[PDB]
Each structure stands twice: as C-alpha cells, then as structure tokens.
C-alpha cells in the first residue's frame with residue numbers, strides 16, 4: 001500500500017483517470033468525473049485514501065489535487081466542447097479561502113476555452129463543520145458564473161435535507177450500494193419528488209448491477225454512473241459508446257412499467273364494475289340504515305376487502321366501520337362522527353370522484369391501524385356521499 | 396435557577412402537562428409530560444436543567460424519575476385510553492440499553508397502564524452512539540407495544556434514511572420554522588410518512604395559519620400554545636371540540652375551493668388548446684415541427700416551451716422555446732427520451748384512458764429554474780403534446796401558485 005510520502009516524492013507520476021456519466025435522454029456520455037491516479041511500481045493505484053486521510057496537511061492535498069485538475073482540464077480543452085466536468089471538492093478545504101483560489105483556476109481555463117457552465121462541483125455537505133450559511137453564501141457566488149453544484153452521499157451521517165434544499169443544488173448524487181430494509185424505494189421516490197420541486201436532477205452512482213440501473217431509471221434518474229456502465233479509464237470514450245445497449249435496456253424498463261401501469265388500471269376498472277354491481281343490487285332495497293348496507297357489502301366483497309365506511313362531501317364519516325378481523329367481520333360504531341379531510345389526497349379525490357363520475361384506487365400506503373400495506377378504493381354514490389373500501393394486497 | 400437549587404429541593408418538583416389534539420375527533424388524545432419546579436412562590440421549567448451538558452447524568456435521571464413517577468401516578472387515575480408522551484434522550488437511555496427505563500414502564504403496566512399508551516419522544520440527531528444499536532433497542536421496546544416518536548423532524552433531523560430505518564410511529568414537526576426549501580422538505584417527509592406508516596404530529600403551533608399548514612399537510616395530531624398551554628392538571632377531553640370543529644370546517648371549505656379554481660382553470664385551458672390545435676391541424680400537410688411553431692405563436696401569451704412525444708416518451712419534434720419574448724427553434728431535442736421523468740408514463744396512460752388533457756403540480760423547470768406547470772394534451776396517432784407554462788402566466792391567473 002501507498003504511503004503519502006511516496007506520492008509527494010513522485011508527484012510527476014500522478015495522472016487523472018475519468019469515469020463517464022450517461023444520460024437517460026440520449027443514452028450518451030454527457031461528461032466525466034475526474035478521479036485521482038498515480039503510477040507507482042509498474043501499476044496504477046487510487047489517491048482516494050490519500051485525499052480522505054485526515055492526518056495529511058491540507059497544502060499537500062491541494063498541491064496534488066492541482067496537478068490532477070490541470071492535467072484533467074488540459075485534456076478537456078481538446079475533447080468535445082459540451083462535455084460536463086465533474087470534480088470532487090471538499091467544502092472545508094475550499095472554504096479555507098472562501099473558494100477564491102479555486103475559482104481563479106477555473107477562470108483561467110475559461111480564457112483557454114472551457115465555458116464555466118460545464119463545471120460540476122461535487123460537494124459533500126455533512127462533512128462541512130463550518131457555518132453552513134456561509135458555505136451556502138459562497139456557492140451562490142459560484143453559480144452566478146454558471147457553475148453547477150452537485151451534492152454527494154445523500155443521507156449517511158450528519159446529512160440533512162433541510163440544509164441540502166437551502167443549497168438549492170443542481171444535482172443530487174445518490175449511491176446504490178445501499179440496495180446491495182425492503183422499503184428503500186420509498187426513500188428514492190421521496191427524494192426524486194423533492195428534487196423535482198426544487199429543480200435538482202438525480203444522478204445515481206455506484207451502479208454495479210442491472211436491477212440497480214432499473215431502480216435508478218424508474219425513480220427519476222436523469223444521469224447514471226457505475227462499473228456496470230463503464231469503469232474509470234485513462235482516456236475518453238466514444239460519446240455514443242453505450243447508446244444501443246442502453247436504448248434496449250431502457251426500452252425494457254419502459255415496457256415493464258407500462259405493463260405495470262396498465263395492469264393496475266385494468267384491475268381498477270373491473271373492481272369498479274364489481275363494486276357498482278354489488279352496490280346497486282343492494283341499494284334497491286329497504287336498508288335505510290347506511291350502516292346495514294356496508295355490512296351487507298362487506299359480505300358481498302368478503303374475499304377482497306378488510307374495511308368499509310362512508311363519508312360526506314366534507315369528509316365527515318357518516319357510518320361506523322365494518323372491519324374484517326381473523327376472517328370475521330366486526331362492526332365498530334364508535335368510528336362514526338370522525339373527519340378525514342386532513343388526510344393527504346382526501347379532498348382532492350372527492351372532487352375527482354365527482355368530476356370523473358367514477359371510482360378508483362389509491363397508490364400503496366401503510367394503514368395506520370393494521371400497519372400493513374394497503375390500497376383504498378373510492379366509489380361515489382347518490383346523494384353526494386362517498387364510499388371507501390380498503391383492500392390488502394393481491395400483489 | 397442553579398442546578399444545585401433543584402437537587403436540594405427535589406421534593407418541590409412536579410409535572411405539568413400539555414394536551415395533544417386529534418384531527419379526527421378534535422379531542423384530547425393524550426399529554427406530553429413536561430418538567431417543572433416550585434421555586435420561591437413560582438413555577439419554572441427544568442428544560443435548561445435537562446439540556447445542560449455540564450450536569451452529570453445520574454442527577455438528570457434522579458429528577459427525571461421524580462417527575463415520571465408523579466406523572467404516571469396521575470395517569471393511573473385519568474382516562475384509560477390516554478397517550479403518555481415522554482421526552483427521553485437517546486444517549487442517557489442507551490447507557491444501559493434502556494433496561495432500567497423499561498422496568499419502570501413494566502412496573503406501571505402491573506399497576507394498570509398497558510404499554511401501548513406510551514409514546515417515547517426520541518431525538519435521533521443528538522445520538523452519538525452507533526445508530527444501528529439504538530435502532531436495535533427501540534425494536535425491543537416496540538415488541539411490548541411501546542410507541543416511538545422522533546423529534547425535530549423537518550429541520551434539525553431530516554434524514555429520510557434514518558426515518559425509514561427507525562420506522563417510527565410518529566414524526567414531530569415544529570412550526571416555529573414558519574414555498575421555501577423548508578416546505579418542500581416536509582412534503583418529501585410527508586410522502587414518506589404515509590408510505591412507512593408514521594403519523595404526523597405538528598408542535599409549537601402559536602398561530603392559526605400554522606394550524607392550517609399543519610392540517611393541510613397531513614397533520615394527524617396537534618400541539619402548541621395556540622391550542623392549550625401546559626398546565627398542572629388535565630382538561631376535559633372535548634375541551635376544544637367545537638372550536639376545532641369549526642376551525643377545521645373552514646380549512647375543508649377553503650381547500651375544496653383552491654382545488655376547484657385550478658381544475659376549472661385546467662378545463663378552460665384544455666378548451667383553448669383543443670380549439671387552437673384542431674384549427675391548425677385541419678387542412679395542414681406540414682410537418683409536426685412546423686405545427687408546433689404555429690401553435691406557440693397561437694399560445695404565445697401563456698406557453699414558453701412546446702414539444703411532442705410518442706407513447707414511449709421519445710420526443711418527436713424539436714423544441715420551440717420562448718426566450719426574451721422571441722420564439723427559437725431547437726432541433727437538438729429531437730429523439731430525446733423522457734420516460735425517466737416522474738409521472739411521465741403515468742400521464743400517458745391517463746391521457747389515453749381519460750381522453751382529456753390536464754396540468755401538473757408546480758415544479759421547478761430544469762433549464763430556466765423558475766416554477767412552472769406543464770399541460771399535457773393527447774393527439775391523434777397515439778401522440779402527446781406538452782406545453783410548459785411560465786410563472787408570468789401562472790402568477791397573474793387565479794390560484795395556480
């Protein structure tokens with residue numbers, strides 16, 4: 001293994017390697033991440049341990065860091081003009097002089113021909129121990145030159161979504177070693193939606209396998225990185241190196257998700273028919289009690305439902321719950337006179353049921369009482385009343 | 396108050412209680428136990444005392460105990476279904492892997508407080524031990540029915556990973572913090588809370604607008620001075636029922652309206668677009684790219700980008716993009732794919748089935764960076780038209796922001 005002294009003594013042997021990043025739009029190389037390499041003893045080894053070592057003085061990190069960047073940016077001057085240049089930069093070291101010296105190094109290469117808006121700067125926020133509002137201040141300055149900001153390692157140690165969103169980054173880098181909790185896609189889904197509202201694109205990294213790439217794609221992944229794509233190498237690659245492979249790999253993701261979306265919408269339709277038949281059959285009868293009715297319905301729909309109740313237009317529960325437990329139905333009258341408009345989507349679905357004049361399923365959510373994952377089916381009725389049915393699973 | 400003052404007069408220490416209110420029944424669901432001492436003809440908080448890092452842990456637990464015993468003695472006599480919210484530091488609890496505390500709880504089960512009424516307010520970002528061990532221990536607690544609530548969610552603790560791991564029963568979000576970054580981050584936590592099954596409890600509600608924010612963003616439970624301040628005794632369970640019933644009626648009414656105003660707006664826009672498109676599409680043998688140019692001029696007042704895609708998200712045309720009040724044509728976006736975008740495929744099969752067009756929620760455009768909405772409109776030949784709306788049009792319409 002490599003002692004730090006070994007590196008500073010042979011500083012002329014240090015070189016950048018590059019890892020390509022691929023777009024979901026054009027399935028093409030959109031830019032590269034600059035990584036640090038040294039030629040020691042007929043072999044190439046990473047300067048990672050060297051940059052990550054807290055024991056090594058900062059100037060020697062910057063000393064080396066510099067030659068790699070110069071070599072890397074010298075290379076970019078000659079490649080395609082629209083390539084992005086992703087660069088790892090510690091917040092604290094960058095903040096030693098409020099980023100002054102670094103920016104001048106970037107400014108230098110603008111003159112030499114690299115537009116500043118090609119620079120993506122990989123910052124790790126939870127590593128920062130200075131005043132966060134000051135770091136956020138500085139990056140503002142950077143952006144006013146078009147410089148892009150990417151935040152690393154989301155959700156690991158001191159990571160913080162409040163502090164991240166304040167930074168209002170251009171990119172979020174999410175690594176998927178995490179995928180090797182079954183419920184991690186909830187994490188991913190949540191992230192993308194936060195990212196969509198503040199306008200940060202998602203870059204998934206450390207993609208070592210296919211299922212990982214699929215996870216990336218179907219959870220809002222705009223850009224992609226990993227060994228499974230292309231490993232870091234000393235030179236650049238043909239921009240459309242993986243185009244056909246990704247085109248086909250993505251076609252298959254699309255097909256899957258559609259077969260997936262249609263299959264659930266189709267299922268919803270038939271269920272609406274089953275419910276419509278059941279309800280109108282029962283509703284032509286002398287069951288004035290709104291409560292008598294849902295009991296009958298539950299027996300009708302015994303195979304697929306586990307809870308049923310009715311509410312009015314403003315979310316007030318008109319009836320009490322029928323609840324299936326241990327294969328038997330129980331009547332819980334106490335649940336009458338409760339309001340549910342506070343629930344996400346609830347009011348939205350009321351006006352949807354009206355306008356659309358049909359019934360439908362919700363997405364998957366975790367029922368507050370039982371705890372297991374369920375879906376609710378909402379069905380509109382005569383007299384501006386709305387029926388709710390709770391369904392567990394059927395995969 | 397010096398800490399010595401407290402330990403010296405430990406017999407003067409007493410719990411106060413703050414009630415917590417349900418959105419369902421607008422009633423008192425339980426109380427948070429808070430720590431107080433009677434010093435010099437007056438009542439003052441032991442907060443500073445529990446938060447002081449200088450004070451040895453034994454003396455914090457010594458006092459803590461006096462309060463919990465008094466508090467739980469009180470609960471033995473109140474209603475049987477009341478929840479008991481209790482502040483507990485992770486690190487002090489982890490000094491003996493929670494063994495002693497649990498035995499204290501176990502004791503009161505015998506005396507008549509079934510364990511599922513206990514909510515344990517933990518602050519995860521204060522923990523400096525191995526997280527997976529703390530997560531390990533709380534599992535044990537839960538297997539007795541003990542409930543777990545995490546504190547300072549939203550700001551100080553905002554780790555979708557940890558939240559997803561500790562898999563808590565409750566998230567406590569405080570609203571002194573009160574769209575900004577902050578409101579979008581609660582959004583993403585909200586979305587998760589419903590997926591992992593954690594109820595939202597909003598606290599530090601000092602005003603009405605705060606309560607409304609709480610309500611419309613998935614708040615199941617509520618706390619603050621604006622509701623009821625802490626006091627040394629319990630309150631009648633339906634103390635605020637009618638006040639909250641009416642205060643919530645007004646939130647419901649409001650939301651039924653902000654939502655209609657946007658759906659109404661969508662309908663008319665669909666008509667405008669339908670008229671424009673079919674006018675331009677009838678007697679035209681010019682290409683799809685030529686068409687969208689004409690359309691952008693048609694819709695010049697309200698659009699800023701227009702393009703078409705096929706059923707699998709491949710962009711059929713270039714873009715027309717309005718810039719500095721002029722329309723530019725961007726051939727480069729031809730043959731780009733967008734199915735990776737959230738909602739994209741979902742909306743294709745929605746446009747088909749429903750056979751109509753509609754707006755998206757508000758999102759931040761990746762190029763311009765301002766907040767926009769997109770309108771999706773289905774066409775003949777299994778093709779789909781998209782139109783990105785600027786803020787300048789959203790801002791001066793009714794309730795699209």
Ligand SMILES: [Ca+2]
Nearest residue numbers: 033088122152
């Ligand atoms: Ca990196």
Ligand SMILES: [Ca+2]
Nearest residue numbers: 427482516546
């Ligand atoms: Ca608390």
